[PDB]
Every structure is written in structure tokens, then in C-alpha cells.
């Protein structure tokens, strides 16, 4: 719908941290809608973008894309500004046809969420263990 401030709760390895995201407008050239975290020095913000295909009349494939990037800060000795050592990315693409129903899309979304809460994938991502 219209963007609002999204407060996400119980995040992290322990399940206590929060993330408050404020809206940052729609890019008119591609329709990507941004959310970012209220943190000082805007090069060091948790950033989330969401992109949905615009509903035409003869579109064959609806496509949703979510991107997450979180940087890390490093106050390097001999400077006044923190820099970015690392980024952590996430890129989720959903692909549907024009005859798909609401329950199929909802099943795919809740399935991906239940897999990310499952011990197969909080072991492949958190500990970097390939499944064998």
C-alpha cells in the first residue's frame, strides 16, 4: 500500500533486536520504493527496497523484488569519518503468472518465511554449512 514506518521486532541470533525503517520515496524511473533506518551518517544505514511490477492489462509475468543491505562501520585510525568495511546483502525475487491466485502467492511467501525460521537455513546462513 502506501509506505509507512515499519517496526520489525525480535531480530538477531537471540531474538531481541528491533529495526525501525522510515520511508524514503519512490524512484519514478523504475518504481522501486525505499525504506531506511534512522541512523546518523547516511552512508551507514540499514536499507531495504521493494519493487513490484505495475499492473498493466497485457502483462504476462508479475515480479516482486526485495533487497536488503546492511553495512558495517569502521572508524579507521587517522581519519574523522567512519568508512564501510563490509556489506551484507539479500535479494528475493518472486515470479508469478497472470492466472495465479492469492493463495498460491501467499503460500510461497509463508513457505519462504517458515524455511528461514527452520534449522536447515539458520544453519546454512548463520554458520555457513552446506546441506549434504
Amino acid at each position: 500500500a502506501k509506505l509507512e514506518t515499519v517496526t520489525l521486532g525480535n531480530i538477531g541470533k537471540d531474538g531481541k533486536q528491533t529495526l525501525v525503517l522510515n520511508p524514503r520515496g519512490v524512484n519514478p524511473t523504475n518504481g522501486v520504493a525505499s525504506l531506511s533506518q534512522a541512523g546518523a551518517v547516511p552512508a551507514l544505514e540499514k536499507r531495504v527496497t521493494v519493487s513490484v511490477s505495475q499492473p498493466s492489462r497485457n502483462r504476462k509475468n508479475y515480479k516482486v523484488q526485495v533487497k536488503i543491505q546492511n553495512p558495517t562501520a569502521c572508524t579507521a585510525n587517522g581519519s574523522c569519518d567512519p568508512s564501510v568495511t563490509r556489506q551484507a546483502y539479500a535479494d528475493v525475487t518472486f515470479s508469478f503468472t497472470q492466472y495465479s491466485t492469492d493463495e498460491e502467492r501467499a503460500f510461497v511467501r509463508t513457505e519462504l518465511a517458515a524455511l528461514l525460521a527452520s534449522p536447515l537455513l539458520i544453519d546454512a546462513i548463520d554458520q555457513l554449512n552446506p546441506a549434504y
Binding site: T5, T7, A38
Partner: protein, 114 residues
Amino acid sequence: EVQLVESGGGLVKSGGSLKLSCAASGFTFSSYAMSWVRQTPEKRLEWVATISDGGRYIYYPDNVEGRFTISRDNAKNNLYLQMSHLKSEDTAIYHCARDSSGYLPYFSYWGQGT
């Protein structure tokens, strides 16, 4: 969702002191003016205090001004009311409120508590 919860509460004697607090999630806290509005047990509303965005301009009525004190913490997103001297009329509910984007407040969002 503009959320405002209160703590402190209290059951005090006369001439004491207490510090009410307010937690204020859901919105950018440091942009808005915040306020305290109490409600007597005979169900009358009374303005208690207002503060500005950064805590510079503070307003009190004449019944309050010498013995209440409010403050902000824009890093912890907390609103504070320091009650003192408690002369037995101070037996109310003491809601938090977010002020309108204005000059002098009309309260749009309210917090139930204490």
C-alpha cells in the same frame, strides 16, 4: 502506529516527589512537541506542560509552574515529568500526548496510563 505507554504510576503522601516516564514508539520522536494532560477523578481534563522539539521552549500553567518539570531524551525516545510537592490535587491519570504540527498544541495522539 503511534504508541505511548507510561510508567511511574504511584501512591505517595503529601509533599513528596515522583518521576513519570513515557516510551513513545511508532514515529520520529525528536521532531514533535510532546505534552502532559492529566484527568481528575471528577473527570476534568487539565493541561500540565508542553515542551518543544529539542527541549528548549517549555510551557506550564500557573497551578503547576513552580513544582513540575518536564524533559526529553531524544536518544532513548523518552518523555519525563518530574512531579514534586504533591499538594493533594495531583491525584489524576497524567496522559502523554503528541502535539499537532503547529504553534500551540491540540493533542492528536494520547497515551493511556498511570
